[PDB]
Amino acid sequence: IKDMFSSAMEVARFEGAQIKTVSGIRGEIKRALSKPEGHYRAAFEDKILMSDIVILRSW
Amino acid sequence: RYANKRFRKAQCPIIERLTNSLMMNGRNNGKKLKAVRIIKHTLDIINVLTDQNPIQVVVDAITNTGPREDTTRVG
Amino acid sequence: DYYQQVQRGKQDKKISR
Amino acid sequence: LDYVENFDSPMQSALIASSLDGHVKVFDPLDNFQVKFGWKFSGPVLSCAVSPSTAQGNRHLVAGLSSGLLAIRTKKKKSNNFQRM
Amino acid sequence: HDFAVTSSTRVQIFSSRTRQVIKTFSRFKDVVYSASFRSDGKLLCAGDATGLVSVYDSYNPRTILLSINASTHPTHVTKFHTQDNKILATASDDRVTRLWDISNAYEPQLELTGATDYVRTLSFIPAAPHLVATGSYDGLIRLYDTRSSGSTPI
Amino acid sequence: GLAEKALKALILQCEENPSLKNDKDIHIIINTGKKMGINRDNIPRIIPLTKYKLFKPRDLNILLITKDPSALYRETLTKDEHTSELFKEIISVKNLRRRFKGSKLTQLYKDFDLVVADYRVHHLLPEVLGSRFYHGSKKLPYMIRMSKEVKLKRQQMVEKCDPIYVRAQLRSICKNTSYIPNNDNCLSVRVGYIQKHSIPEILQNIQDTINFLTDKSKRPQGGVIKGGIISIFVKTSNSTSLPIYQF
Amino acid sequence: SLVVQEFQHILRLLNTNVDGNIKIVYALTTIKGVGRRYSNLVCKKADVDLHKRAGELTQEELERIVQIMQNPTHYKIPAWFLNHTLANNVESKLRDDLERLKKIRXXXXXXXX
Amino acid sequence: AVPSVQTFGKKKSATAVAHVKAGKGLIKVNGSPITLVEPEILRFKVYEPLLLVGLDKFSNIDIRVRVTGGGHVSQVYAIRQAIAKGLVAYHQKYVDEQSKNELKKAFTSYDRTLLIADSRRPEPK
RNA sequence: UGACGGAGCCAGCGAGUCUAACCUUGGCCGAGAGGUCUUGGUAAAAACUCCGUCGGGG
């Protein structure tokens, strides 16, 4: 998932976070992807689309 | 299969047993058709130089170079 | 100074719009 | 010089020789080495040789000059039921 | 169907029927004087100006099969024996002719010598495989018996 | 009578800004009145130059993309001494897809200056040659009729190429420029090189393109613009648009 | 017993020493930048045999190669056929990005001391 | 009808489906003669069932062989297997039995891998 | 245990209406959201066999 976190260090403050999507599937964000500075791998419970918009709740 | 029994390795026809020892390097492991193409090119050379036979020479080569008494380390 | 006069012409047309 | 023997020719044994004049003359040991035929090439001729007797093709007389020239000269060389009746 | 032709640093192979260059040997350093074939027909010679005869198979210009470092003087004439197909004989500018057995390209089998000046031809004789006609440049065609000591002519 | 003062302001500013300094072509972009009904294929329709030239074919890195068997096209083109040095690399489609995958394709975008396919494999090419070249129309692949030989229906078309004729096509495709049709009104065509030849060379080159695109005659290649051209706009790849002939 | 013929080894062409005992198609390639195919064309343009050695080629035929090689465009040569200080600032930028961020978090404060 | 016999030949992951029928003496592999097999050094590895028993016994028969799977070598061990099996299973069917035991004793003394698939199933020690 | 260029032929797992990029100059339409076209830059079966050619590091 791209352009939610700016740096690879910013992801590391947030790993293990219960990400959800519009479609209603859950998941977690696990490791900061390195070779681009922003992105990260995240394991959902089922196959996310391309047309789909992940949202991480926060306070 | 020549690796299974202890002395099954003897009945390999030695021309193959010479090609098998040609692919001994990490640049060369698992390339037999390169090695067979060498021997068929090598056995031609032994004819052109020494008319006799290549395969009589290869047999006569192994008879000469194999040692007769080898030395071992003792405790 | 003619190029910038055109360049400001198209730019000011947007901000009028 | 060159010698060739027992080939398709009226002269059995041929002896050709270069003379550094372009001048290759052909001699024969059966006829007491008398002069038989002569070519003349442009510059002086160093190497000359003939195709052997076992050639079974177009022969060659290849003579080589000092000036860089090779000079090659050569002697070149219905239906089934209708056929059952 | 083929004949070799020497040049400056080049032995070419022409054809019989097409009369054009089939293959070209060019790996020589300096001028190559003589290019004979063996009586078998498989494998040809070439003697250089650096004094090395480099015998290899014909129809294959990329594999110098056997590079006999002959005399340091330039070898003019390298021929194969007509009778026995594995004994080579070269000459040199060193005024010695060397009968090379190409089982052993590192030692001459016999040093055939006694020449006064510039051997630039030798040729073998059909009835005798031991006898070798060797012509100096001083005159004086030498005749040798290679089964003898050979250092003197007969 | 507005052209040169518009165009002098282009070239003068082309020297000053360093971002503007890097680009080396002059486009004219034309907003015709009605929408052009032809959709965008990537078949580049070339226009003729009546007076000047744009490039001799010995000025460009030229890639040629040919068919699969490709030995009839490799060795006829090389030896026949009209096209020995004319092509930079003769490449096969089978040897294009297999060889250049991934990030080598950006280098080949940057290595060659003008790319030309055989016409009968020009359509297969946007999957092979890649989606880099189909950003605009600089390195857009031209096609050459290889053979001077027609395919009759229910008839074997023989394979044969004659390097007089493909030399003749590259001379006819490098001296003049090329447009591409769009479903909308705005289209672009390059007019001259920024330092090969100056303003009165370009100014003659302007009036040919607006004349060839307007004629009802020469129709399948020039009969595109219907009605009247509203405006033409001189600008490079990076500069702003400079108006000329506003009606 | 005379015979006569038409050799000079290492020679200087365009300030470059050209080795004599090799092919001119390859002896010209030791000059900096000129391609192998570029050395292949000029021998064709100057009507010189490709497989000659460099120790041949009289000075008549040498300068005709020189006139083509230093002036290509007058001999129908195709034009294609011719031959980090922003690191150290952004390294200083990126460590100051870390060093500020080492201050804001508490755990990263133990590093440099 | 037409007398045929179908035998299989199998090395690493390559099958070999050799139809053998009475005919004139052509031997095809994948719609191509057997003198055009790819690896060009191992072409005599498939001439073994031709030349071991003698080339006369192919004068009346056809050998249509088609192969898939495997590599360059491990197909050549499949066409030498299915030609040996396809020859020795035509003499027990449509020619004489004493031919077959002459063949099956000929391929055996030379190389038994021609007939039965040498399956190199694993072993745990 | 080379370098290059063609030619030759060889697999086995894999098929969720799902499989996929950024940045930029410019035109036109639209009240706007945006639409559409334009433009340049940056990322992103093999070994094997056969032929042709070749013979210190930055």
Q: Angle of helix F199-212 relative to helix F3-16, nearest 10 degrees?
A: 120
Mutate to test the interface with B, among E86, E87, E104, E109 (most CBs of B within 10 A): E86
- Residue with the two structure tokens 């050709």: D16
Q: Are F85 and G79 in contact (CB < 8 Å)?
A: no
Both tokens of F134, joined, read 């189909």
Domain boundary among F152, F176, F200: F176
Spell out which chain F residues touch chain G, with contact meaning CB-CB distance below 8 angstroms: 58-62, 84-86, 88, 113
F142-144 and F114-118: which strand pairing? parallel
Distance CA F228, CA F245 (A): 11
Same domain (yes/no): F62, F94:
yes
Element at E78 (helix H, strand E): strand E78-80
CA distance to E20, G86, H91, per residue, from H62 (Å): 45, 76, 13
Same domain for F122 and F229, yes or no, is no
Same domain, F47 and F61: no
**Same-domain status, F82 and F140:** yes
Task: Name the closest residue on chain D to residue G1, using Cα atoms.
Answer: D20
Element (H, E) at F115: strand F114-118
Please identify residues in chain F, positions 5-44, with a C-beta within 7 angstroms of any atom of strand I.
23, 25, 27, 29, 31, 40
Q: Would you give the DSSP letter of residue F158?
A: P
Which chain F residue lies closest to G77 (C-alpha atoms)? F58
* Residue H50 near residue H83, CB atoms below 8 Å: yes
Nearest Cα neighbor of E80 from E116, E118, E34 is E34
Interior/surface letters F83-101, b for 16+ CB within 10 angstroms, e for the rest: bbbbbbebbbbeebeeebe
Same domain, F118 and F213: no
F134 and F41, same structural domain? no
The answer to whether the C-beta of H13 is closer than 7 A to strand I is: yes
CA-based torsion, H91, H94, H98, H99: positive or negative: negative
The residues of E between 22 and 81 with beta carbon within 7 Å of nucleic strand I are: 26-27, 62
Q: CA of A35 vs C1' of I43, distance in Å?
A: 11
Domain shared by F79 and F96, yes or no: yes
Q: Closest nucleotide (CA of B36 to C1')?
A: I49
Find the DSSP H helices in chain F: 3-16, 18-21, 71-79, 94-97, 104-111, 125-128, 163-174, 199-212, 219-222
* Residue F212 CB in 7 A reach of strand I: no
Q: Is the CB of B37 under 7 A from strand I?
A: yes
Report the C-alpha gap between B47 and E99 in whole angstroms.
20
**What length does chain F have?**
247
Instruction: Tell which of F176, F199, F231 closes a domain.
Output: F176
Residue type, D67: S
Other C-beta atoms lying within 10 Å of the C-beta of residue B64: 6
Q: What residue numbers bound the domain in which F230 lies?
A: 1-55+177-246
* Number of domains composing chain F: 2
CA distance E66 to E51: 14
The pair of three-digit structure tokens given for residue G40, joined into one six-digit string: 């292949």
Q: Do G78 and F85 touch (CB under 8 A)?
A: yes
CB count, 10 Å around CB of A51? 7
**B32-49 vs B54-65: helix crossing angle, rounded to 10:** 100
Query: F124, F142, F176: which is the final residue of a domain?
Result: F176
Angle at B40 between CA H105 and CA B25, to 5 degrees: 105
Residue F173 burial (CB < 10 Å; 0-12/13-18/19+)? Answer: buried
Same domain membership, residue F64 and residue F120: yes
Q: Tell me which residue of F128, F120, F117, F126 sits closest to F166, measured CA to CA.
A: F117
Q: Are residues F107 and F140 in the same domain?
A: yes
Helix (H) or strand (E) holding B62: helix B54-65
User: Does residue C17 belong to the interface with chain F, where contact is any CB pair within 8 Å?
Assistant: no
Question: How is F14-29 classified by DSSP, letter by letter?
Answer: HHH-HHHHS----EEE
Same domain, F19 and F80: no
- Identify the DSSP state of E134: E
Cβ contact E43–B50 (<8 Å)? no
Tell me how far apart the alpha carbons of residues D36 and D34 are, in angstroms, rounded to a whole number: 6
Distance from CA of B40 to the nearest CA of H (A): 9
Whether F165 and F199 map to the same domain: the answer is: no
CB contact under 8 A, G80 and F59: yes
- Residue H122, Cβ neighbours under 10 Å: how many? 4
What CATH number is given for H1-125 in this structure?
3.30.230.10
Indicate if F34 and F145 belong to the same structural domain: no
Provide the total of helices (H) and of strands (E) in chain C, helices listed first: 1, 0
